[PDB]
């Protein structure tokens, strides 16, 4: 028994197109270095036959391989080449403002997952210009495991083409898929007492009080668009299935950014956006709630006493 070099190599683009439109790879790698081209074949002396992909055995990853074993044979020192074409599928995360995504497998790409070929101004591209491609209505073999498999036509597909691999993802619409705010909770009957420099939204049910600067946020901030409609429908949902109709809507729905960085939708009854993050422990608001309550109550008594 002697050595065992094993190197991991990106297919050529014509082959990428074959792979994902036929669920099969060619049994030969060829790369030119310096002058001549070099070439490897699967089992020795083989031809350039096609080879279909089949499933591996498993993590979050999903692999498809064209050969499930390793091989060799017995006068002088001989060196067999085992050729394996392998398509693997990893989840990649990427967080705002999406100037790069990364896989659990150590790939890091400095392109926006939403760099629709057109919108580099409203997005980011920052990998090798040489190697990046995009193909509108692009066919895909929809399941590499089975070879009969139907065909999907993906809207927009990118290919990055790195040294150890070629990376592909389906280009989506930002704003359509990403929303930067999430419904925390709703407080029916909240009390907006005004103060020196701040409103105090005291909620008994969620045992806490929130303070906002006195200038509410423009409702037409683009930031709010992804929950804008939900928030009103969340509001109207209450004033409909909460109290009777002796109460009635005072003033329009107004939105406030609170210190700490929540965002509050307000709708009264009767008878321009900090890039900040949300604060994690909400005691600071239960604290404000405590003070607000005792102080409110103390003044009430001591007044009616005096």
């Amino acid at each position, epitope marked *: 028994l002697l050595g065992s070099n094993t190197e991991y190599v990106a297919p050529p683009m014509w082959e990428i197109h074959h792979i994902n439109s036929h669920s099969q790879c060619y049994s030969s790698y060829s790369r030119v270095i310096a002058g001549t081209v070099f070439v490897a074949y699967h089992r020795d002396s083989y031809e350039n036959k096609t080879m279909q992909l089949m499933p591996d055995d498993y993590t979050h990853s999903t692999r498809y391989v064209t050969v499930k074993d390793q091989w060799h044979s017995r006068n002088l020192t001989r060196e067999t080449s085992n050729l394996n074409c392998m398509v693997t599928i990893t989840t990649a995360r990427s967080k705002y403002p999406y100037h790069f995504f990364a896989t659990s497998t150590g790939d890091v790409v400095d392109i926006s997952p939403f760099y629709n*070929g*057109t919108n580099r101004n409203a997005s980011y591209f920052g990998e090798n210009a040489d190697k990046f491609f995009i193909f509108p209505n692009y066919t895909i073999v929809s399941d590499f495991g089975r070879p009969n498999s139907a065909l999907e036509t993906h809207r927009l597909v990118a290919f990055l083409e790195r040294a150890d691999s070629v990376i592909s993802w389906d280009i989506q619409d930002e704003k359509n898929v990403t929303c930067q705010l999430t419904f925390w909770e709703a407080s029916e009957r909240t009390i907006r007492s005004e103060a020196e420099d701040s409103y105090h939204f005291s909620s008994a049910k969620m045992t806490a009080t929130f303070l906002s600067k006195k200038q509410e946020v423009n409702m037409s901030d683009s930031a709010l668009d992804c929950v804008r409609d939900e928030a009103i429908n969340k509001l109207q949902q209450i004033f409909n299935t909460s109290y009777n109709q002796t109460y009635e809507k005072y003033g329009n729905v107004s939105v406030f950014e609170t210190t700490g960085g929540l965002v509050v939708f307000w709708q009264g009854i009767k008878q321009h956006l900090s890039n900040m993050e949300s604060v994690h422990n909400l005691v600071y608001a239960q604290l404000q709630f405590t003070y607000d309550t005792l102080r409110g109550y103390i003044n009430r008594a001591l007044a009616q006493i005096a």
Partner: antibody
Amino acid sequence: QLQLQESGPGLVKPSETLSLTCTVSGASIDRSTYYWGWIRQPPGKGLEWIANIYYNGRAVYSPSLKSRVTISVDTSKNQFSLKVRDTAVYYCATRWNYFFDFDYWGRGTLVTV
Amino acid sequence: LTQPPSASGTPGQRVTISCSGSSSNIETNYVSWYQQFPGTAPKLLIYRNNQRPSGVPDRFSGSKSGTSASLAISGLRSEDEAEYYCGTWDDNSWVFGGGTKLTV
């Protein structure tokens, strides 16, 4: 956002060399470059394509200029220039987008021979 | 490349423009059109044939076959008065056509 301005001489005696340098407030060229070329237009005439260069030394000229043109690039100060050895308004437009073609334009001042 | 230096239409007419080159250019590549208001720099109007950048309405159109292209500005109005230029990649570089003044 992308940004392209232009400086350079505005009075050239015949047969003498002209130098035009286009500054970008991208502000970088990268291996993520695509193309950056020159485009000239005689006032009252149509548009004419001049030269074109990548972050590598290689470049593409129009033989209409019989390669009288010769462009240069300094990534250091984030600029690319041009050398010529016929009077018009000039421009520097680029490629900043897969698909498309020529997008993002920079006003390039007027020069007269 | 080739373009007729003018064109005409009353407000609401489907005006068209041809774009003539050889088989070296428009045959095996992609056409781009540009709405240059006089005194400014050209805005891409149509990219890689028929496709419209964000902003350009459905009124403008694309069309290509053989070694000549087209640009159909239906629903023609006033502000559409500008200088439209077509152009693609020949086998070695970038070229423009003559140009056309739209007058309504």
